[model samples]
Target: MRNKIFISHATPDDNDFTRWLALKLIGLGYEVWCDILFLDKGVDFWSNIEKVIREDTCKFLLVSSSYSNQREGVLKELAVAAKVKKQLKDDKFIIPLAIDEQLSYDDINIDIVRLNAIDFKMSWARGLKDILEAFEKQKVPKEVADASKSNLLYQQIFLHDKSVIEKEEIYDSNWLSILSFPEELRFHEYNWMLPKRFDVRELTFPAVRYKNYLCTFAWAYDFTYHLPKTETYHKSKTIRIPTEEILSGSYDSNFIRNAECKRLIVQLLNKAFELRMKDKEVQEYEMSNKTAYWLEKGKLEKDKFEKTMLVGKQKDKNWHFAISGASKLYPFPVLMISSHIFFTADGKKLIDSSSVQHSSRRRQGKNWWNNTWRTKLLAFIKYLSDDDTSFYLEMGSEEKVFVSNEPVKFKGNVSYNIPEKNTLEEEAELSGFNQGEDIEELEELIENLEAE
Candidate 1:
């Protein structure tokens, strides 16, 4: 990396563009130090930044904006750069690049008015090219322009000794973090993976207003927007949970109360987290689409008779799936509530996750891979696919009894929908607390959720 670039810009206003520019330069083999790229924690911030400006930085680009005319930081940096130039006799050290053509002389508090500022807003590529050209005018190494991606990464630490006297930006950090790890590792590369689950962090409901009341977003992932630093690869698909369906258990149903929706969202988040962990477990195996399935006490026994049952896209919500042994019952370990699953085998006295585990190692020995049931899994699936029938496993005395694959229907009801209008009369019909006492709860929840 040759060009030691320092970006001076305002937060929020010029952050996005500043970061974009920094990476643009960094990719070209320049050592760039923006705040996000430079600092971590526990540094003597002011002293370090002053040193970067005065001693190390080759080009100090001011992210100029007329409206974002906050100049205290800018002036201090400029003075530092000017001092460095005076001491070292380097004229191309401090360059101000305005966001657009609108940076009037008055907009910048420095005497750099006579110098030609690059127009980044009008044409970022043109601005980038101009900046590179200016750098070329100075003493530049031939290899600097064609640096490797890995080499560019090492420069962050290379600037370490230089920047302790160091200092735009998280967007840049987020970008670098996301791009640092090359994506698409083979499956075994992810063998030592974590669950990579999300918490209630990214949940949002947006508004309480009543299309029947549609929000721009229903629920979202607590996106970190970066790849994990560990060589291990662990990732989870972000699900946009339909708050509407979450509330009513179906998209074509009435809404639930706003407060209750949040609680359910938390529940959904936990379940989603568990499902992600389950994916990690399954990832450890390399299985064929069709395999022998048998249920002993239950479907699994280290390596036992298992089903050749194929799981495909068409296999759906109102379906029961398991690869088995000779056992009469195999626990639906991965029962997805999202698939409207009510129970496993028979709903007589269904067990929970712990019992599911306990049942795997029972008194009769864990030899459950005996899929000797009369009904063939293929026949069941064909029957299910051929019609809208869904099988429910109601609880039984000795084992689960299979409910007939009859027409699937929601046999339960859950609700908390907010009313369309807020008035003294309609309020009472809903969770009315008069002249807006409840709105405080609503607003507070909204704010907290938005923070997530």
Candidate 2:
């Protein structure tokens, strides 16, 4: 009769991960039992849970983490599981899954100390693989018909608990509004008979090289500025073609479809943004094929900047920020900004990479609320503005690309019902790392740039 996989975890703290693992097991046709889904509102919850563990569960999966190890309820379940293992005479009756890296083996409950835990710390999918392989090797029973039925039941109950409602929510995007740019885009072609390949890096301004042509928004003189006489090209042999025509596939259909053109467009836009960034003295950090710009130490007149605004949920926070040029072409051009505070240990410099971004984010917790982020983002945009409304990037021919001071916003037709606060989001708020604690003494780092 014992066939179900029972998942035990610290309530609320690990519920998010617990639900995910349960659903995945159910999808694989494995019968699963977890208090959240298996127990109803009016029944004897703990009694039923104990009954299931004593009789129905073949495998007791301990969702191990710092919270679960310290929690009385989770530990009690593990103790019960240990007793069940002895009664059943199954050495592999209990399987512990380590979700949080902070949960040290030395600190784990003594009952499960001798057991080797399956790691879900760095990669969940990889851990899931090990889990499936274990089940296969152990010959765990699975029922296809029951799994589909239970999966349906689980979805219905879970969805009813957190029903989706149509709602309009305005979101902030990293896409800075493009006010205007050169009315005409041009492609410059130059005749090359030399055998050795031309070093395109020699050109100072923004330019993309084709088979025997240079695609740019700049003129011939700009291309000649960085090269010596031998590398120079005759203006008479150079041909100017409307980029719109070529992009439309009229001039050369092949150029439009090839990655060469996409690469050229990306390069041109990013280069223009880079030129403006360099002018503003924002130092660059080379990352792979792209680069990021951050306000460096002593790069500005002030060592620290903070502003109070009436626009967002939270009022004020540090103003030090970083901007990276757009790497994508669709959904309107955008520049990525670190949603978390960017500053060094001393708070005197910007930490170019966002490795510290998430660390600071977790530490600040509620202090860096979304509204505060909205205000800080707007403040950063204001900081970049030339006339407090818009900034321009010069594309080398007296032509300029103007950027709006505001972030792009869109109205959604339908919004899914947001599940009420759970351990997932609640854990961050409960962490209580304090406002601005991220910039202080924290050393660990993780990088993720999220769109507001």
Candidate 3:
């Protein structure tokens, strides 16, 4: 009964948008309970959702996008939510948000037609504001307003005014330490053997999927390819990454080299990686949880094709360095996304990242995401040393940690040549993952592209 919000969304198209909204709303002190947050291996899915809708939920948010009108599951949820909304006070529970401008209402549920949809497609700011305003117009829930000055500080921005992004001082020093140095998650070894250097700037990978369920940090440089006309068949040539470019442009102003930062972002190339390796279902298992969307019926139609990135058009190396691995993101139990920065739920200034603004699904593979972290580091040292900014494994929490500002020294035989043949010798599966075959036809797929 602690102010819960139920997210009714098309699992596919609105995944990121919903995730984005969920994170923001949580920071604002709302007890958000979506299917993504409550599912389990043995629970009755429908009964469980029904219980939450009828018992615990206060707000039913319908996520709108192009895929919204298509899903039967979402349709069913909307029908149920409409009934629930009718019972709530002030007719304020079920809210519709247009996450994307491409949303189609042609076949949308009849229940949503009467509710005004907040257009967040133009700006997440506008959408958040309108929803917050709608929340205030209703009475009751005195607990939220009377919670404490900390919880309800700046309620005006919480309700309306999209231009203002709520900002707060992150008072945790340890968190600051993590923000200053990302090598906290550092490792010198990578599972990737060696990637094929396609163009001087392009690094093509043999399809090897990886999953880091603890926290997955995806950037924008990554992309996906198809095997000719088939959508289900992804060849070894499926992923394309940038390895040689000097990644630059940071937004957090770490260039003064004054603040602790992701000294090693440009080196963090686009590659294949996943975040879910195994499970802990017995002793409290976890995942992005939002992943149920991808596992719904056939396959995730959009994520495989969505080319999201870490470094966007402005390409903030600082933000890239932060998300590149320094932070654990929403999957963690912690409310803080950054050790260096924090947010106040968009009622003022935001600790938003440009990289997260893009998609991170391009490098993902079947039941896993392929990460080329080590490969990117190697590429950075070999090809992008001159013009790229200085990055580090960790600079430490105090003054001048012992990290090399100079280019990384290479000591062994390095292969710059693309394999004479496209045959990828798949590494044997071991710790936490299954290794699949890189079809012989997969080799020819790359060759055809090579010729082109």
lDDT of 1 at 220: 20
Q: What would the TM-scores of all predictions be?
A: 0.34, 0.49, 0.32
Give the RMSD in angstroms, all C-alphas superposed, for model 1.
28.9
**Candidate 1 lDDT over residue span 66-174, tens digit each:** 6446557666666766666677676566666666465445643443642465555667677677766876776565234554764556565434343322111111000
Best-matching candidate per lDDT: 2
Model 1 Cα shift for residue 197 (angstroms): 55
True-structure RMSD, every candidate: 28.9, 13.9, 27.8
- Residue-level lDDT tens digits of model 2 in 1-452: 66777766775565765666777677677777666664465256567779877666777777677776555676677777777777777777667777778655645455654356566778878878877787788676765634576567766646565655678877767777776745545554454533236665445577676666666777666544455443565656555556444445565554344334556767777766677777777555554445545565554445434554421222233434444556465544554454433445443544565555555555555445566667666766677789866787776767676777677787876676645664467456555433456664332422332322
The C-alpha stretches of model 3 lying farther than 4 A from their native spots are 38-43, 87-90, 139-452
Off by over 4 Å in 2: 1-162, 179-184, 191-203, 228-236, 246-251, 254-259, 287-290, 297-320, 331-342, 345-367, 415-429, 432-452
Ten-residue segment with the worst summed lDDT in candidate 3?
276-285
Q: Residues 199-221, candidate 3, lDDT per residue (tens digit)?
A: 31232321222221111122111
lDDT, residue 387, model 2: 81
How does candidate 2 score on lDDT?
A: 0.61
